[PDB]
Amino acid sequence: MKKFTCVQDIGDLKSALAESFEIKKDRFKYVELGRNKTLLMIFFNSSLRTRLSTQKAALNLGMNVIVLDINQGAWKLETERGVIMDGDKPEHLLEAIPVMGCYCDIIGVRSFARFENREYDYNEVIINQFIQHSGRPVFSMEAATRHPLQSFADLITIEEYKKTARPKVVMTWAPHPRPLPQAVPNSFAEWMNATDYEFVITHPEGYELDPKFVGNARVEYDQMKAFEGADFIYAKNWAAYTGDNYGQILSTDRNWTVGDRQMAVTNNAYFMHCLPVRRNMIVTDDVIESPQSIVIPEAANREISATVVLKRLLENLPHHHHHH
Amino acid sequence: MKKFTCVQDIGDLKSALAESFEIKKDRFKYVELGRNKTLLMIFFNSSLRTRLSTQKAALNLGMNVIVLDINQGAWKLETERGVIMDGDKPEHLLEAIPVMGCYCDIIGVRSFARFENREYDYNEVIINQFIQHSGRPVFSMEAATRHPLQSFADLITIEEYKKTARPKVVMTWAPHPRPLPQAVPNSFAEWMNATDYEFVITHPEGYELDPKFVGNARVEYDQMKAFEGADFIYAKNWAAYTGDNYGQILSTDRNWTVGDRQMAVTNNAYFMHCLPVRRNMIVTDDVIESPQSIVIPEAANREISATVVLKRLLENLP
Amino acid sequence: MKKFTCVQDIGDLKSALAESFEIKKDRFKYVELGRNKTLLMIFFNSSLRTRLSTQKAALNLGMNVIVLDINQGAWKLETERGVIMDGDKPEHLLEAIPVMGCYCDIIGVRSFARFENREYDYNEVIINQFIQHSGRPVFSMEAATRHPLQSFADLITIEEYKKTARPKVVMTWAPHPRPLPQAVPNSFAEWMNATDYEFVITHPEGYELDPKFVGNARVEYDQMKAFEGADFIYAKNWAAYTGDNYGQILSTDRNWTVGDRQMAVTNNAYFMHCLPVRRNMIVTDDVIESPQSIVIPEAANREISATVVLKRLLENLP
Incomplete structure (x- = not known):
């Protein structure tokens, strides 16, 4: 699994299901697996349900969890080149997302369909920016067109x-x-x-x-x-x-x-x-x-x-990492 | 103790006090008691003092802690039967509260006195809903009419x-x-x-x-x-x-x-x-x-x- | 080191740098150091970068972490004596800060320059109140006039x-x-x-x-x-x-x-x-x-x- 945004990511459903029921009966069987591993949960649209269930899951695996809530007004990312950034956007995609990948091991992203343009919504812009530039495995906490969890x-x-x-x-x-x-x-x-x-x-x-x-x-x-x-x-x-x-x-x-x-x-x-x-x-x-x-x-x-x-x-x- | 909303819940004062002093002197004595146990703290009225002291206490017991902040408007729960719910309440009590109890072991609730209707305030509706429907033990982080902590x-x-x-x-x-x-x-x-x-x-x-x-x-x-x-x-x-x-x-x-x-x-x-x-x-x-x-x-x-x-x-x- | 607000606090530079590269290569080497220790992070200005990097650091040391976000203006501590407190200030410095220090071991504070009065800004009032009254080591997560981290x-x-x-x-x-x-x-x-x-x-x-x-x-x-x-x-x-x-x-x-x-x-x-x-x-x-x-x-x-x-x-x- 390199990311979790669609059914294809989970691979064979049989072993996935086997794992599910093993965990339903022995909830903390893998509590040592996430020891000293950090999950960054980012919400671009507030939640209480997905927030709670995702956090509890991470704890089942002994992971550290960091949650960030970002409002639409605090996510003004410049995406283009040659732009004189003297306006609204205080940051460019190319520095903002990679930096977030700096402090965690896995990122969960909750995006949303804004319903103003089909192309844009179905392009799944926010989650794909994290996939492409965060440098970390990304899983969807609900996107604009899917909700794999x-x-x-x-x-x-x-x-x-x-x-x-x-x-x-x-x-x-x-x-x-x-x-x-x-x-x-x-x-x-x-x-x-x-x-x-x-x-x-x-x-x-x-x-x-x-x-x-x-x-x-x-x-x-x-x-x-x-x-x-x-x-x-x-x-x-x-x-x-x-x-x-x-x-x-x-x-x-x-x-x-x-x-x-x-x-x-x-x-x-x-x-x-x-x-x-x-x-x-x-x-x-x-x-x-x-x-x-x-x-x-x-x-x-x-x-x-x-x-x-x-x-x-x-x-x-x-298992290994880069150091300058 | 099945819940903690009033003095009666704590039982014998002498032993509760002996334990209090035992923990004052050896703060992390029971740090293993709460391993892999999750405390869910829910604030319907913001706070900072109770929020901080309660989290510190749960860490004294080695518990996982999840804090949720729910402001008014984010808590419109339908309680009646036969309602065409196409209004402002997005969900029914019989779904929302049991669901919350699915991901935790203990629930702390901080509710509040509205002051527009005494009968309602003194009925402690929010905290009683969680006790009746969460499926988990509930303690008050300050209710409308009591603050046992x-x-x-x-x-x-x-x-x-x-x-x-x-x-x-x-x-x-x-x-x-x-x-x-x-x-x-x-x-x-x-x-x-x-x-x-x-x-x-x-x-x-x-x-x-x-x-x-x-x-x-x-x-x-x-x-x-x-x-x-x-x-x-x-x-x-x-x-x-x-x-x-x-x-x-x-x-x-x-x-x-x-x-x-x-x-x-x-x-x-x-x-x-x-x-x-x-x-x-x-x-x-x-x-x-x-x-x-x-x-x-x-x-x-x-x-x-x-x-x-x-x-x-x-x-x-x- | 009893506090961290400026270069003098770090002490010898070579040694601090040595520890830095050591941790860069073995991130969790000192994860037992902060066991049962609680860090209180207080933001008087919301952040994402400092908030995220500081929490990760505490986790590297096995610390418990509690983050408080306090709205600018929602923090008005009275500092004077003989004041009839029936205004907007909810509490006095002498109570508020020492109390926050009761529930934690170390405090990180992110303050800011309001740019209204130079002298007030350069007096670093907020970070100093915490240093003088919280009873705990304090470090700056960015102040009005320095950003040592x-x-x-x-x-x-x-x-x-x-x-x-x-x-x-x-x-x-x-x-x-x-x-x-x-x-x-x-x-x-x-x-x-x-x-x-x-x-x-x-x-x-x-x-x-x-x-x-x-x-x-x-x-x-x-x-x-x-x-x-x-x-x-x-x-x-x-x-x-x-x-x-x-x-x-x-x-x-x-x-x-x-x-x-x-x-x-x-x-x-x-x-x-x-x-x-x-x-x-x-x-x-x-x-x-x-x-x-x-x-x-x-x-x-x-x-x-x-x-x-x-x-x-x-x-x-x-």
Whole structure:
């Protein structure tokens, strides 16, 4: 593992999963692995959830942790050459990022989609600057178009609760009052496509995701049809992506809200959601509070996916270093 | 001990005190007790004193520490069923709090009195939500109506300095420009009631505290009379609690400001204050700088009460 | 070493430098030194560079670390006696600082020059309050008029890259859009004056630094003349200091911007800057991107100077 931004980085899912469950049962088995190794967690958009679970994971590995919160207004990086820097930006990319790599061994970066330009957002500018110039292994704490730590945790929980080898897993859109990134849905599809599960995506018209993420997944427009015989339901809202609707809410249709009506059609499926969840918009009180709701164990698994990811990066650190 | 929000949680005062003094002399004696145990400190009201002393205490026990700062607006939790949550609350209580409890072993919560509705403040909603839903032991880093880490430090201080078995301890109100919560005075009263000390409360008319907290204290409205023969003076301002004056300032009378006039009548009493303290409003420069002022050793003991509390909680984990 | 605010505090330079290169090659050699020791970092000005490098250093020594961020103006300690404290000042110096020292073993303080009153700034009020009242060794994470951690890192960097025993080191002013403090320039001169290097200061007329820092150093107003034969070029902008211009920008002359024109007359000199750096204002892309630019290794050395300082402060605790 040279970085952790997408499913490809984790390699064979089997050993990754083996490691996950070994750690779930013996949390500090690798507490000596990160001794005197330092993690730098950088948030360009405040978090409380990813902040806590990532920190706990690092501690499972005996690592030192340094957290930095940087507001958009404090991240003015000049990127071009020949610029007379007498304006806003007090620093150039070429000195600012490498210097941060000076004081740590691994960097976690949490970026975000600003929803003003699709190209820019999908270019994943912030995380790629750290990959390219920090001089350290970088893992994503959620980027503009993926959230691998979330997806990995989601995969761990399906493996944890599934009744068969190849469950039918359905990812469904649901309404939200705000325009949301397609980072979680993109990522979930990417990871599900990497498994042997029967994977289906249902969403209203106009909410199609990028083909590179959708891949060969069956896209069903009839939510009830898609839900039939499902073993797991993964609900998530996202703003539009294609055409000229990028970044916008095209619907707030609560008929998509996951309730007993759609769940009744499944094979008594488990209910999943990455959190935070707005009840009766994404899912009903009855469904999220039922015994098939595993949103809490799913959240607990965020500590595990982080712990395995950090373990892998720790195992991939170079043994020797440069000294002038 | 399953939580730490009031004096009752600490049980027998004698053994809690023996442990306090054992740790004062050998600070890192239990540094292994907390290895691979994670303390999550959550501040809903910013702080720096409790923040610093609590972290230092957890390190005394070798614990990992994670601090979260949540300001208002970042804590809108839905609590009702059947709500179409497309408003300002981004999540429900039944998801948010259990999730937080997933990544830690012990949780410290610092909540606060809002002052716009007494019933709500005294219901201690935020801290009770964490106790009921986190799945972890919870301790108060100051709540809306109690501050047991402070009172426990105050108790250790009085035992450390007392010149008699059952000293006369006097808690007195003093003027302040802002409306302050009843947390420290309620909590101090609650802890003094658990001792065998002679305890007196003195404050202007209208500033009475919840009988739930005043307990068996003798209330004396004449401050000079209350001070008579005192061995310890614990000064603290609080906004009104009773009637329709909840959360309001009824007085700013500096006759209550603790100076030599009142101290002269005590048995050369020690002077105590939880801090921060406004000089010449709460207490005079000469009093707070006199040999019997023990405000600093008292603040030092915040580290001790917190490590004894964290140690008791650690000893009670599954 | 009981404190670290200036070059005298480091003691013998050779020995401090020896420890620096030792730690550079064996970063965790003294990780047991700071076991159960707590460092309190206090920022009165938010930072990312100093915050990050100082925390890493403490970890190199196995220390516990607590970082406090205190908003400018949220820190108003009353210093006078007989003051009726019903204003904006929440507490008195005499209580506040000693209390913070109760919960830690070493304190790092990052203060700043407000540029409102020269004399107040040069009195280094904040760092001195901590030194005089906290009861703990204190080190500057950057003050109003010095930045010893930065200067020490710079010294390490020159020692690390020097091609000769006594290189010619030149500190040159360069233009900036805003009024910057003289802390870095004052400190670099202070440290260079302590070495046996050929040290030259070059700036526009009016940018003279306090003679307390310039001391016996050579000041050359002709930038090119100052540059010829140099082995190291240390660039930094600062606002005027002398007389009526304290804190003011007297020039933004891009003729001082360090580019190939000036570097050409040096003996292929290395280029240094403490960061952050405005390109084409302080130095051109070509110079800062050439192999003679050691701005990053210089920044890396901030970790090393802070580790040596913390190590020496630790070695001298009771």
